[PDB]
């Protein structure tokens, strides 16, 4: 596509510049171009891909929630019996959000997941597949909603199975996966008890493995453990 004439290394360099400049749409476009070169991504490069699209979709999710809230009030008992504009603009933002998610899912399917054989890469990509199906589920109605939810679940579950076999309980990718799957259970799947159980087991198993870690690894793992605790405090 548009980045087809730019060197892979230049795309990566410019993605890092875009991050520094808080130009996340540019960052995502550079990283999409890098993926489309066809080579596997290094750990650092996977992280750049994730940061770029997390920030793009994050702005869209925040906007969608604002507009959805306004739309719910306007169709409350006796509010602005107004025109189609709120719905139209919410729908515009929704379609753009869905397009970003579809783009990410398309990169994962062509061909990042299939060429990912190491546990770190495969878990990372499967987690990302679950996350972007989850973002689709946040806005979904109509006949395929259940199916979007099951796609998220299936991706997270395959990631979980690999992570438990192949990674220690403090591994940051394993922890972030468990955190996000617990959010899926609580916010998407109407399964708060499963969410709570998963967060607690994850936290406790990580705590028992901290003794194996260096000072730097300890810092990385405990940061994510605190997010598990923060959710448990919200949920219980």
């Amino acid at each position: 596509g548009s980045m087809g004439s730019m060197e892979r290394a230049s795309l990566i360099q410019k993605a890092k510049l875009a991050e520094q400049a808080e130009r996340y749409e540019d960052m995502a476009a550079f990283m999409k171009g890098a993926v489309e070169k066809g080579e596997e991504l290094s750990c650092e490069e996977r992280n750049l891909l994730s940061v770029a699209y997390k920030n793009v979709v994050g702005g869209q999710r925040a906007a969608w929630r604002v507009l959805s809230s306004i739309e719910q009030k306007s169709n409350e008992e006796g509010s602005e019996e107004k025109g189609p504009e709120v719905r139209e603009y919410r729908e515009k933002v929704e379609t753009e959000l869905q397009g970003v998610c579809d783009t990410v899912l398309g990169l994962l399917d062509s061909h990042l997941i299939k060429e990912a054989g190491d546990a770190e890469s495969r878990v990372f990509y499967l987690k990302m597949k679950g996350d972007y199906y989850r973002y689709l589920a946040e806005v979904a109605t109509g006949d395929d909603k259940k199916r979007i939810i099951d796609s998220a679940r299936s991706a997270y579950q395959e990631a979980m199975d690999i992570s438990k076999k192949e990674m220690p309980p403090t591994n940051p990718i394993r922890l972030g996966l468990a955190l996000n799957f617990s959010v899926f259970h609580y916010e998407i799947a109407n399964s708060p008890e499963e969410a709570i159980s998963l967060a607690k087991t994850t936290f406790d198993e990580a705590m028992a493995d901290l003794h194996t870690l260096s000072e730097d690894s300890y810092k990385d793992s405990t940061l994510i453990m605190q997010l598990l605790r923060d959710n448990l405090t919200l949920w219980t």
Binding site: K54, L175, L179
Partner: peptide, 10 residues
């Protein structure tokens, strides 16, 4: 408040 998720870094 919505639940907190995580990717890469804070």
């Amino acid at each position: 408040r919505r639940s907190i998720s995580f990717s890469v870094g804070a």
